[PDB]
Structure formats: C-alpha cells, structure tokens
Swiss-Prot record:
Coiled coil: none
Result for mutant: A179 to E/G: Impaired serine/threonine-protein kinase activity
Role noted for this protein: Serine/threonine kinase that acts as a key regulator of ciliogenesis: controls the initiation of ciliogenesis by binding to the distal end of the basal body and promoting the removal of CCP110, which caps the mother centriole, leading to the recruitment of IFT proteins, which build the ciliary axoneme. Has some substrate preference for proteins that are already phosphorylated on a Tyr residue at the +2 position relative to the phosphorylation site. Able to phosphorylate tau on serines in vitro.
Protein name, as recorded: Tau-tubulin kinase 2
Subcellular location, principal: other
Keyword annotations from UniProtKB, A to Z: ATP-binding, Cell projection, Cilium, Cilium biogenesis/degradation, Cytoplasm, Cytoskeleton, Kinase, Neurodegeneration, Nucleotide-binding, Nucleus, Phosphoprotein, Serine/threonine-protein kinase, Spinocerebellar ataxia, Transferase
Keyword Nucleus: yes
Amino acid sequence: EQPDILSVGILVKERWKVLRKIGGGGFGEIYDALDMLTRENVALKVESAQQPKQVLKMEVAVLKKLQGKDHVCRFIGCGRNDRFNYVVMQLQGRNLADLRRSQSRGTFTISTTLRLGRQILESIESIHSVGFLHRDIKPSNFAMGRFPSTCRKCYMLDFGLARQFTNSCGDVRPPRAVAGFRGTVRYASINAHRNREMGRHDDLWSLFYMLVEFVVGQLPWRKIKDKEQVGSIKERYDHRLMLKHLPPEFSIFLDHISSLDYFTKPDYQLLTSVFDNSIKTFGVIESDPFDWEK
Ligand SMILES: Clc1ccccc1Oc1ccc(Nc2ncnc3[nH]ccc23)cc1
C-alpha cells in the first residue's frame, strides 16, 4: 500500500513537528504535531498536492470565516507546496463516533443526546450564518475538547465537503440541476441520495438522523450497503416512527424540517426551543455527567 503523506518526525515550515498520524479522513490525513512557536500540541491536516479531489482550500476558507464563533477549532496556519497542502488547527479530544460506539448498546441517554444535539444545532446555525453548508454532518466530524475548560464543549472538526450557498449579501445562490454527492450514505438526506443541490435543511436532516442513532443505537438502513437501496428506504420512510424514543417536542422539529426546501431559511429559534424545552422537561442541567464520565 502507499506510505503516509508525511513522515513522522519531519518539521513543516520550520515550526510543526509531526508526531503521529491520528486519522485518515475522506480526502486526507490528520496528525498530532508539536507547534514549536507556541510549544503546544496541534492538529495538522494534509492532502497530496497531486490527489484528484483536494478540499483543504475549503477547510481553510470556512475555518477562517468561523474564527470567533463557538464549536470551532482555533486556526493556527496553512500552506501549499509541490508535495502537499496543509492546515493547522486546535487539537481536540474524544470523537463522538468513538464515544457512541463505547456505550453498552451504542446508545446515549436522553440527557447526553439533548445536550450534544443542542451544541451541534448551534454549530450548524453558525456555519449557515457565514454562508456555508456543511453537507457532511455525521458523528466523526464532532469531538469534545481535551482540557478541563473545553471537554464539555463539542467542536465541529472538518469542513472539507462544505459549499458556499450565498452571495456576500446573503442572497441564496441558484441551485445546480445536478449535484454529485460525496458525503456519508448513513446520515445523508434524501436530497443527497437524489443528487440534488443540498440546502440548510439537509444539514438539519443529518442532525435528526444523528440524534435518532444516539437514542436508538441504530438507523433503519444500518445493514443496507447499496446507496440507491438506502435512498429508496429514506424516500418512503415515515420519519414519525423515529419520534418514539425522542422527547415529545421533536414532533415540532420533524414537522419543521419536513416543511423546508433549498429556498426556505430554517426557523433556527423554533428548533433551538425544541432542545431548550426538552432539556427543562427532563430536568437536565449542563453540569450533569455525560455518559462517558459516569
Ligand atoms: Cl477517521 C475517524 C472515524 C471515526 C472515529 C474517529 C476517527 O478518527 C478521527 C481522528 C481525528 C479527527 N479530527 C480531529 N481530531 C482531533 N482534533 C482535531 N482538530 C481538528 C480536527 C481534529 C477526526 C476523526
């Protein structure tokens, strides 16, 4: 097989010492590096300068646009050379995909589910607010922080598959007739399955699928490998069935996102109220242990 894009031990730009590969994402690799200017560990994403689909230009654009916002890594640096392109950003902790898989039945409690869900909704409204769609909402794109002050904060980790959906003014851009989906079958909306231009609502469908998987431990199309079979299930599926194990106000959430299309701005305050009201009804407070603490 092919070697890692970077050799562990090298120094990037006389500053970032590559320590270990920590992931092999969709379109590149991620490393733990030592930043010798700040004397801290950081995350270093890289892609080959020669690979057919390169997304780190999008990663840098969105990370920069989101600086100052919650739920996003601090931007540290970026560069392009004949061998590779790279982006450096804040290193986070345990990934939600791993935390969920460590649970007894791959389920989180409603306490952990509601708090994570509300943080993730905040992160989606934030990326939409600067004119980008995420298009790849799934548990492995979120992690908790790795310090006492950050480990109760959930971070949106990656923006590779993002698309700008507005003008400078906030005008929604005319959709393409066909849009070739490159994200994850399991959490993709029907519109992704249909190679339609994705909208703000498609990120909220993916959040709805994540929340259901958190509470139930699986989605109805878990064992189906064929993308066009999954899509056929989603097209026909009565999503009200997924309300069974969610707090009652999720009927409002589901009715709202069902009403949306590419050209309709979500009612983010309504969707936030579903989480706020559910959290109060269930007596959840922010300091309650998450499932992985206790
Ligand atoms: Cl590929 C995968 C699938 C499922 C569960 C974990 C996985 O591994 C990683 C490893 C690292 C990341 N990303 C990050 N991690 C830690 N700090 C980070 N700052 C920015 C990104 C980033 C994501 C998934």
